[PDB]
From a paper:
P-glycoprotein (Pgp, also known as MDR-1 and ABCB1) is a prominent member of the human ATP-binding cassette (ABC) efflux transporters that removes a large variety of chemically unrelated hydrophobic compounds from cells. For Pgp and ABC transporters in general, ATP binding, hydrolysis, and subsequent release of the cleaved products (inorganic phosphate and ADP) fuel large-scale conformational changes that ultimately result in translocation of substrates across the membrane bilayer. To address this fundamental question and overcome the dynamic and transient nature of substrate translocation, we tethered a substrate molecule covalently to specific residues along the putative translocation pathway of Pgp and utilized cryoEM to capture Pgp structures with bound substrate during various stages of transport. In conjunction with molecular dynamics simulations, our structures trace the substrate passage across the membrane and identify conformational changes in transmembrane helix 1 (TM1) as regulators of substrate transport.
L335C in transmembrane helix 6 (TM6) and V978C in TM12 are situated at symmetric positions on opposing TMD halves, while L971C is located two helical turns above V978. Only after adding Mg2+ ATP to fuel substrate translocation, Pgp971 reacted with AAC-DNPT, but Pgp302 did not (data not shown). For Pgp971, we prepared the covalent complex in the presence of Mg2+ ATP and stabilized the resulting OF complex with vanadate in a post-hydrolysis intermediate state. For Pgp978 and Pgp971, only OF conformations with a single bound ligand (OF978-1lig and OF971-1lig) were captured at 2.9 Å and 3 Å resolution, respectively. However, in OF335-1lig, OF978-1lig, and OF971-1lig, TM1 swings out at A63, dilating the transmembrane passage and providing sufficient space for accommodating the bound ligand. Strikingly, along with the upward movement of the ligand (from L335C to V978C to L971C), the TM1 loop is progressively lifted and restabilized. Interestingly, the extracellular gate is sealed in all OF structures, which is especially surprising for OF971-1lig where the ligand is near the tunnel exit. During the last stages of transport (OF971-1lig to OF335-nolig), the TM1-TM2 regulatory loop straightens, and the substrate-interacting hydrophobic residues (M74 and F78) rotate and pivot away from the tunnel, which facilitates the escape of the substrate from the transporter. Although OF971-1lig captured a post-hydrolysis state, we cannot rule out the possibility of ligand release prior to ATP hydrolysis, when it is not covalently bound.
Numbering used by the authors: 34 to 625, 683 to 1271
């Protein structure tokens, strides 16, 4: 991985880098050549000659003729000087722009090569690795490359060109002294390389810690609903805090090593100064070198050293970029075993429907010890329907996944028409099969767009036909924005049944040759299920169909039914034979806005948030002023020492006394090293602590918000993660070492100004008359940068949304073969910041050229005015070139200040957004302690005429009116059609939303009056399609009560009560078995049962089951229901179910249509009053 960061540089990028390097070399060798022309070195001082020759220079007119010639030669410089500046105005641009143009073109291509690779890996790779980190790798990690292959390289080459040109000019004039000085540069190289490797290693680890924090944040934000229901905000915050603390610990060490690198560089530069003076004194003692010659070398080898000292940060940035490019290119270079982008494979023109499963042995990559399938055999002829039945966790979804070739069977072969599916092209194979997953997942787009994912070239007529066949037409057209209605992420703004019909339509619209249904009627009502099964029965002969069901009514008419037992199919035949066979199937059947742009002082408000670190800042600013004012003060000291050296007395004893002055240079080097390290370290550590607390506060505020805040289409999971990372990563770029260099530069300007006024006079006016133009350049830059910051942030959250949406839902994306579509969407999202980067590149080039050229112009104007003033005789020739050094350093510091305004402009907008998110208080405040906390509750729930509509489609009334009353130790059953609002009442009892009209009572007390945390802790909830975190089984069960430490014994009791303890015991690592993202490393039944155990371990007073047996075998349903019935006494229970067997025993059943409470009563009462309930019970008859 050495020197591979530029893998994606084409010919245009190569010429950009080459011409930029040449321009950088030209711009660097300017300073060596400004001295080489003024290297004639024999004009010396006529006045210095005058102290010796005052008797000779007593003549008034001949001393004037000298002064007048001095003008002539001085203007001779200011001419050349101006020309030099003109040249800079070209070459400076040509470097920065081009290097930036070479970086933006590669960073843009890296992101597309990264994401493509992410979409190229297979399902086993996603199962093994933690993919929640990938999102940060896309946003933060690649960003660290952008700052290390840009114009920083150009400025590095500029400084090294300055250094080496000065050393070569020095070699031509004074060779020995030059070798003695150059013998130190290997130490600089060794130090810089060692510090660079250390810094790169630390950056790798810091990026890893940030990726882990991002994975935690993404997992929490995707399951925020279960987080809020169980009150788990503090534990997620603590996990985030631990990752942030590790990242801060790494960042502090990074700051320490970078600052120690800079300090060591400066120390060794001053040591080189001392060595040069000592060798020069020795040489003039041996008389081998003319004193003139010694100043020729000194004045030619001693500025590129400070150039290298200034170039150290570019080395740091490149090291950080190399450290960041590790994981990105490791993922890029990976090659899938099952390649879905390969063009080499069989693509049969005619395909019938014969499936073959011979001797299928398979174990998942994550759990190799556990065997799932062992000798599986299955023959599926064409036009036939083969149903898969058995206990939950048997391996039916595994077989359906093997059909799509998401995994390679370990033993045996899966084949179509006698051809191994390995030989057939992966994309072609996955394109000819339609799939409905067990809990179907949609994307955060319109209904029509979601259906269009199944097949791209579908007309509205075909979409409508598929929707009609899927029994989804009525609710779609009942919605405003019929096919343009926005569904939430993971289709969470539709009901479970509606989402399932949308997925069925998506699978049907691609006219599959092989149809795969994974319990496609799990969330449907008996009437909806009957309609859907009839519709798929009408068109069945054209395509073979494999179906998995726990509702055996759909299986009743299947051509062939296969039963699972021990990873093999034990029974195989039609309904008649299997009932005659008296086997597992028989038992299963017989079982019974803009906000005022950006406010000023937002960045000031962030810094004021970092007020506990005031000693750090005061120490840093004292060190900054000291080491900033040293450089002009060191220039004055150098001038005085040179004046002593050139006019040294005849004894050699005092030449050694100036050699004693060389120790003052070592003292200055040591003190500069201390001050540089101190200021850098203090500012870096303060910035790190500010960044850590800033991300902590932003995430804490995010967890505080209402559910209505998460349903907002701008607040998606990917958008939230991108905002969380970026809003704090942009403040960091203007609060660390950059504020330190700002303070150093303002101190430098002040010191240079003070030196200018005292030593000479009237050249200070020039130094003040120039600052406004550099300020104007800064302003004209800052305007464009401020606009682009808002635009880039807004459109970067859009790309983060796409990336997270694709990564989290990768199995659906692969099943639908939509990797190319998501790459295209990602690129289209990336397009705008690309052009912003190009414009920003050219703007930086222009600004840099202007600042440097105006520096040279200021030098030329200084010499012009100095010559004109020497014509007035007001001030001597020593001060004119001293104030020249002062103006040089001060104006250059002011120019370097200007390269910061873009960062300040981004930091102020990020600061404003961070302040806005932190102070946002919700209507239903989770963190609020105020509110009623009853000492005991009777256990009564009353929905006394509740009228509610969701705050995403507020025109639609979801609960037009319904009155419910619940007594302690009773049981409500909630039945009805899909979309009737059964889940809505449970979400209201959870205080996820607040009803407009009506009210909800707990023991006759308004729910708003009670404390939200207490109310949520008094009740336990199981949702329609449960979400399990990517942790151990016991950790997921222990999530039931976060206000105490749940015992392992209690976890085992809860697991046993939920009919899951057997499976967990059978697993290696037992309850410590790690379940994957969203519980996808378990089956639907096991995940549901573990969710039941989680809601049971807390022993709630109010139990809220929401289709808690939706994905469960009838034998598992019976056991779970009888266990629930044992504890029905002394426990209020509310049950939402579409399978009516678990409902007959309930104390009372309420049938709701479209949000109304029309029918209620016991099972006998509802069965007697023939109507909706009687029709639902007797659908199959
Ligand atoms: C900021 C400081 C610390 C930079 C220190 C590292 C430099 C020595 C690097 C940075 C940019 C690099 C250049 C960027 C890209 C290329 C293209 C590269 O061409 C390739 O793609 C590889 C060779 C080939 O196959 O032709 C040749 C080296 C070169 C000029 C690199 C040479 C090494 C450079 C100058
Ligand atoms: C031929 C050289 C050794 C003569 C001495 C030249 C010097 C002026 C020094 C000062 C800074 C040095 C550079 C500091 C930074 C680096 C990066 C470092 O290599 C890496 O990039 C290491 C990997 C990483 O970045 O983590 C060592 C080489 C190089 C180009 C150094 C080369 C030698 C340089 C130019
Ligand atoms: S003029 C202010 C500063 N120079 C000195 O303080 C100084 C003391 S003694 C001395 N310079 C000897 C006489 N100078 C040289 O030998 C010499 C050769 S080339 C050269 N100076 C170039 C033209 N000087 C500078 O660039 C320069 C900037 S500030 C400065 N000297
Ligand atoms: N990605 C995975 N990694 C590891 N183990 C898995 C993975 N997916 C499933 N398993 C396990 O392998 C077994 C097969 O479960 P599978 O999903 O095939 O069941 P199923 O027949 O679809 O049942 P259900 O009716 O519960 O949906 C189960 O024990 C399950 O926990
Ligand atoms: N978060 C949401 N935002 C907007 N509308 C929603 C949201 N959740 C549900 N809806 C809509 O409100 C209505 C209420 O449906 P709800 O989910 O309450 O039904 P349900 O009885 O739980 O359904 P099922 O039995 O299919 O699970 C439906 O029309 C649904 O599309
Ligand atoms: Mg399954
Ligand atoms: Mg529901």
């Amino acid at each position: 991985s050495v020197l591979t960061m530029f893998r994606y540089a084409g010919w245009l990028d190569r010429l950009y880098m080459l011409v930029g390097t040449l321009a950088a070399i030209i711009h660097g060798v300017a300073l060596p050549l400004m001295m080489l022309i003024f290297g004639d070195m024999t004009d010396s001082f006529a006045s210095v000659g005058q102290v010796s020759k005052q008797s000779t220079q007593m003549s008034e007119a001949d001393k004037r003729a000298m002064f007048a010639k001095l003008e002539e030669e001085m203007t001779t410089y200011a001419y050349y000087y101006t020309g030099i500046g003109a040249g800079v105005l070209i070459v400076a641009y040509i470097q920065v722009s081009f290097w930036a143009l070479a970086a933006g073109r590669q960073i843009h291509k890296i992101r597309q090569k990264f994401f493509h690779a992410i979409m190229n890996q297979e399902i086993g790779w996603f199962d093994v690795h933690d993919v929640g980190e990938l999102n940060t790798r896309l946003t933060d990690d690649v960003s660290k490359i952008n700052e290390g292959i840009g114009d920083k390289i150009g400025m590095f080459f500029q400084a090294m060109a300055t250094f080496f040109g000065g050393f070569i000019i020095g070699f031509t004039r004074g060779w020995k002294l030059t070798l003695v000085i150059l013998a130190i540069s290997p130490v600089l190289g060794l130090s810089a390389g060692i510090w660079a490797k250390i810094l790169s290693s630390f950056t790798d680890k810091e990026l890893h810690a940030y990726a882990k924090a991002g994975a935690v944040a993404e997992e929490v934000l995707a399951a925020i609903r279960t987080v809020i229901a169980f009150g788990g905000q503090k534990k997620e915050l603590e996990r985030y805090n631990n990752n942030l603390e590790e990242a801060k610990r790494l960042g502090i060490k990074k700051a320490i090593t970078a600052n120690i690198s800079m300090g060591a560089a400066f120390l060794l530069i001053y040591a080189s100064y001392a060595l040069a003076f000592w060798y020069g004194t020795s040489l003039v003692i041996s008389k081998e070198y003319s004193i003139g010659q010694v100043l020729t070398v000194f004045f030619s080898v001693l500025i590129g050293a400070f150039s290298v000292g200034q170039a150290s940060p570019n080395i740091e940035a490149f090291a950080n970029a190399r450290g960041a490019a590790y994981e990105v290119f490791k993922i890029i270079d990976n090659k899938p075993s099952i390649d879905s982008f390969s063009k080499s494979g069989h693509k049969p023109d005619n395909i019938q429907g014969n499936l073959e499963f011979k001797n299928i042995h398979f174990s998942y990559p994550s759990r190799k010890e556990v065997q799932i399938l062992k000798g599986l055999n299955l023959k599926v002829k064409s036009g036939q329907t083969v149903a898969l039945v058995g206990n939950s966790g048997g391996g039916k979804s595994t077989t359906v996944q093997l059909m799509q070739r998401l995994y390679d069977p370990l033993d045996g072969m899966v084949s179509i028409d006698g051809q191994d599916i390995r030989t057939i092209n992966v994309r072609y194979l996955r394109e000819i099969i339609g799939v409905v997953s067990q809990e179907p997942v949609l994307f955060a787009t319109t209904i029509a767009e979601n259906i269009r994912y199944g097949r791209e070239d579908v007309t509205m007529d075909e979409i409508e036909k598929a929707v009609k066949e899927a029994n989804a037409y009525d609710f779609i057209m009942k919605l405003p924005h019929q096919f343009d209605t926005l569904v939430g992420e993971r289709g969470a703004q539709l009901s479970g049944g509606q989402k399932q019909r949308i997925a069925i339509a998506r699978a049907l619209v691609r006219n599959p040759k092989i149809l795969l249904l994974d319990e496609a009627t799990s969330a449907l009502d008996t009437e909806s299920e009957a309609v859907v099964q009839a519709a798929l029965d009408k068109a069945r002969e054209g395509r073979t169909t494999i179906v998995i069901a726990h509702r055996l009514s759909t299986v009743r008419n299947a051509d062939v039914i296969a039963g699972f037992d021990g990873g093999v199919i034990v029974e195989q035949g039609n309904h008649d034979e299997l009932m005659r066979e008296k086997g597992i199937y028989f038992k299963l059947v017989m079982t019974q806005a803009l906000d005022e742009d950006v406010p000023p002082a937002s960045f000031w408000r962030i810094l004021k948030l970092n007020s506990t670190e005031w000693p750090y800042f005061v120490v840093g600013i004292f060190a900054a002023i000291i080491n900033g004012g040293l450089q002009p003060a060191f220039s004055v000291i150098f001038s005085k020492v040179v004046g002593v050296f050139t006019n040294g007395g005849p004894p050699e004893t005092q030449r050694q006394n100036s050699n004693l002055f060389s120790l003052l240079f070592l003292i200055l080097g040591i003190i500069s090293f201390i001050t540089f390290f101190l200021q850098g370290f203090t500012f870096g550590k303060a910035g790190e602590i500010l960044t850590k607390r800033l991300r902590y506060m932003v995430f804490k505020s995010m967890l505080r918000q209402d559910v209505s805040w998460f349903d907002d289409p701008k607040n998606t999971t990917g958008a939230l993660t991108t905002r969380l990372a970026n809003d704090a990563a942009q403040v960091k770029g203007a609060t660390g070492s950059r504020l330190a260099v700002i303070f150093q530069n303002i101190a430098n300007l002040g010191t240079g100004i003070i030196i200018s006024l005292i030593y000479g006079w009237q050249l200070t006016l020039l130094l003040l008359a120039i600052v406004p133009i550099i300020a104007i350049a800064g302003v004209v830059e800052m305007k464009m940068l401020s606009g682009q910051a808002l635009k880039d942030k807004k459109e970067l959250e859009g790309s983060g949304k796409i990336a997270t949406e694709a990564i989290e839902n990768f199995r659906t994306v692969v099943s639908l073969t939509r990797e190319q579509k998501f790459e295209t969407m990602y690129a289209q999202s990336l397009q705008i910041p690309y052009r912003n980067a190009m414009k920003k590149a050219h703007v930086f080039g222009i600004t840099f050229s202007f600042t440097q050229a105006m520096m040279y112009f200021s030098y030329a104007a200084a010499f012009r005015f100095g010559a004109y003033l020497v014509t007035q005789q007001l001030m001597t020739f020593e001060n004119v070139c001293l104030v020249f050094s002062a103006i040089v350093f001060g104006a250059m510091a002011v120019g370097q200040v200007s390269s910061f305004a873009p960062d300040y402009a981004k930091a102020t907008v990020s600061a404003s957004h961070i302040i806005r998110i932190i102070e946002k208080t919700p209507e239903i405040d989770s963190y609020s302690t105020q509110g009623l906390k009853p000492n005991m509750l009777e256990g009564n729930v009353q929905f006394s005429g509740v009228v509610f509509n969701y705050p995403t489609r507020p025109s639609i009334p979801v609960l037009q009116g319904l009155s419910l009353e619940v007594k302690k130790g009773q049981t409500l059953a909630l039945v009805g059609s899909s979309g009737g609002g059964k889940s809505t009442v449970v979400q209201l009892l959870e205080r996820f939303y607040d009803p407009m009209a009506g009210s909800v009572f707990l023991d006759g007390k308004e729910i708003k009056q009670l404390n939200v945390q207490w109310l949520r802790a008094q009740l336990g909830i199981v949702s329609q399609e449960p979400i399990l975190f990517d942790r151990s089984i016991a950790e997921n069960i222990a999530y039931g009560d976060n206000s105490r430490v749940v015992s392992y014994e209690e976890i085992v009791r809860a697991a046993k009560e939920a009919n899951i303890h057997q499976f967990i015991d059978s697993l290696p690592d037992k309850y410590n078995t790690r379940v994957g993202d969203k519980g996808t490393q378990l089956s639907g039944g096991q995940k549901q049962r573990i969710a039941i155990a989680r809601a049971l371990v807390r022993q709630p007073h109010i139990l809220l089951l929401d289709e808690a047996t939706s994905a469960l075998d009838t034998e598992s349903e019976k056991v779970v229901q009888e266990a629930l019935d044992k504890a029905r006494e002394g426990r209020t229970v509310i049950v939402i179910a579409h399978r009516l067997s678990t409902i007959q025993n309930a104390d009372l059943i309420v049938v709701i249509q479209n949000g109304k409470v029309k029918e209620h009563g016991t099972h006998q009462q509802l069965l007697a009053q023939k109507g909706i309930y009687f029709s639902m019970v007797s659908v199959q008859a």
